[PDB]
């Protein structure tokens, strides 16, 4: 990971980048900010290209569609908590999801959105914005504190709060036992296993395939071939109150890469600054990382975006 470029938010006394994703027009990166703005930057020059007002509170997370026509944003406390934006010619809101604090596109045909409100998953149609489904069963819930509902690679299954759902039947098919307080788990890109905190479960059998202690409290993302996994550990203290939560960046100061087939470790990278987000481009040539240089972490938040060459 050779450093290629660095830049901070233009105009602003304290740089407020909070999250990032490469846009379809490569060389340009989309970043959310702590003031609910979506901004476009040239990742090589550091030149701000555009700014759009998306939310009345800090952007927490975002996801562009693969075809570059749509964008999902999630905010912090203001409603709508998530929104869907059109990126063709003019930028504007197509739909809003007022109570979902997290949203993802469906994965195969990106024709739906899955939002999360606490323990509950919502599936929406991208065209109409209609809620197509609610997935929640209080007798199976694990009540994961940072639950995130997610589609599998073919969109026929959903993982929500540690419960595996069959979409077409809106039926829960399996409940994975609870072994941590926060992380609810993601699908592996191969479609045949799930990664729930430190537990790797086989969807063929529900046998435990791997214990990976390094993944505790981690979020993960895969390179586009599905051969490498990035993971970074959330900063936690559940005994933190509301004020103490804001004092922290989302992640610690290191991320790890793992072989995606057997979870063996590849690299451990410590950028010596706490991490807000990271992403790769579709070709996995570049890694973008939002790094806080603030002396007291997110207390005096002051983030830069670093572009690294993926070797």
């Amino acid at each position: 990971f050779r450093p290629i470029s660095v830049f901070r938010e233009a105009n602003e006394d304290e740089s407020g980048f909070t999250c990032c994703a490469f846009s379809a027009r490569e060389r340009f990166l989309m970043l959310g900010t702590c003031t609910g703005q979506l901004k476009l930057y040239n990742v090589f020059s550091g030149q701000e290209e555009a700014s759009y007002n998306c939310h009345n509170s800090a952007i927490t997370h975002l996801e562009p569609s693969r075809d570059g026509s749509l964008l999902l944003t999630s905010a912090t406390w203001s409603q709508p908590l998530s929104a869907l934006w059109g990126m063709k010619s003019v930028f504007d809101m197509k739909h809003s999801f007022t109570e979902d604090h997290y949203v993802e596109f469906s994965k195969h045909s990106q024709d739906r959105v899955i939002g999360t409100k606490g323990d509950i998953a919502h599936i929406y149609d991208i065209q109409t914005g209609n809620k197509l489904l609610t997935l929640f069963n209080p007798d199976l819930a694990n009540n994961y504190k940072r639950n995130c509902a997610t589609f599998n690679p073919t969109d026929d299954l959903v993982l929500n709060d540690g419960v595996l759902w069959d979409v077409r039947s809106a039926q829960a098919i399996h409940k994975f036992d609870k072994f941590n307080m926060n992380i609810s788990g993601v699908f592996h890109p191969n479609g045949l296993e799930v990664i729930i905190n430190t537990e790797i479960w086989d969807l063929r059998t529900f046998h435990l395939l791997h214990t990976v202690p390094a993944l505790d409290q981690c979020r993960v993302v895969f390179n586009h071939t599905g051969t490498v996994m990035y993971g970074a550990m959330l900063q936690a203290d559940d005994e933190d109150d509301l004020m103490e939560e804001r004092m922290k960046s989302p992640f610690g100061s290191s991320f790890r890469t793992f072989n995606a087939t057997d979870y063996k470790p590849i690299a451990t990278i410590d950028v010596k600054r706490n991490i807000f987000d990271l992403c790769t481009d579709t070709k996995d040539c570049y890694l973008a990382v939002i790094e806080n240089q603030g002396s007291m972490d997110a207390l005096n938040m002051d983030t830069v975006c670093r572009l690294y060459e993926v070797g």
């Binding site: 203001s78 409603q79 109150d241």
Partner: protein, 304 residues
């Protein structure tokens, strides 16, 4: 004529940001609430710690005195308010009903009702003696930042992140006025003037405005300070010169001439946002309180 407030005492003791300071109506005490979940009582003239009042489960956003100085009400992030007997320090009632954090509270002049405002976008009116909710007002489409009774208790004013101030009939709960100007940035604070004729409102565009709410007219604008993020309390200073008083996100207390709208003083000393100020009821004394990187309360005294 300008005041000459000068620093007399600094009150340390809270272990997290101080959210609200309030002089008792009899002038003897200062009450302070804190993110540390505690209410502390101090001597209003000597600044000496008197006692700690405890019972909330999470941070406290606001506290308020009953007219006779014997009770307090607090509003908490734990989604309740509590009514306290000041002498004993005991919790007389817990008011339960809000579905999220309670940010603002006040007794009415008669002291038989409490009004509360919440992140859940409602205003609620409570029976002081039963501890029960009398009315739930669907007051706003965004979090409520302040609630206040007028001088005869017949009206409530509320302010909200939806950009609106609203006036309510205490008895019926009917909305009687919606104040909005040329824009609607979040309204972060509001209260009635002591004569009941005006409304003083802060918006998160670094601006305070004095409204004739009956006429629906903005009469005075006060600027020069920094207020774009926090819900800073503000006051009419009426014991000497006629001022407007407010904290500021540059860590200063600002004082304006009410009529001319010019800044007449800025009080330096705090090391974080000055989120709360209070004007003593009979003497030219100001209390100020600051957030997490400061944690102290300051007492200032002026000759006019």
């Amino acid at each position: 004529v300008k005041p000459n407030y000068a620093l007399k005492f600094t009150l340390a003791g809270h272990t997290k940001a101080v959210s609200s300071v309030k002089f008792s109506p009899n002038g003897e005490w200062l009450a302070s609430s804190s993110a540390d979940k505690l209410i502390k009582i101090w001597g209003a003239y000597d600044g000496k710690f008197e006692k700690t009042i405890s019972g909330h489960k999470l941070g406290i956003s606001d506290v308020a005195w009953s007219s006779d100085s014997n009770l307090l009400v607090s509003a908490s992030d734990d989604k309740t308010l509590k009514i306290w007997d000041v002498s004993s320090g005991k919790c007389l009632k817990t008011l339960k009903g809000h579905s999220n954090y309670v940010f603002c509270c006040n007794f009415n002049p008669q002291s038989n009702l409490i009004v509360s405002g919440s992140f859940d976008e409602s205003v609620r009116i409570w029976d002081v003696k039963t501890g029960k909710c009398l009315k739930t007002l669907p007051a706003h489409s965004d979090p409520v930042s302040a609630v206040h009774f007028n001088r005869d208790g017949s009206l409530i004013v509320s302010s909200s992140y939806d950009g609106l101030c609203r006036i309510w009939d205490t008895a019926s709960g009917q909305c009687l006025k919606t104040l909005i100007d040329d824009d609607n940035p979040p309204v972060s604070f509001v209260k009635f003037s002591p004569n009941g004729k005006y409304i003083l409102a802060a918006t998160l565009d670094n601006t305070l405005k004095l409204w004739d709410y009956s006429k629906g007219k903005c009469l005075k604008t006060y600027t020069g300070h920094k207020n774009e993020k926090y819900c800073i309390f503000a006051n009419f200073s009426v014991t000497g010169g006629k001022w407007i008083v407010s904290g500021s996100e540059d860590n200063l207390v600002y004082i304006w001439n009410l009529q001319t709208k010019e800044i007449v003083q800025k009080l330096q000393g705090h090391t974080d946002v000055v989120i709360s100020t209070a004007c003593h009821p009979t003497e030219n004394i100001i209390a100020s309180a600051a957030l997490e990187n400061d944690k102290t309360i300051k007492l200032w005294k002026s000759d006019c």
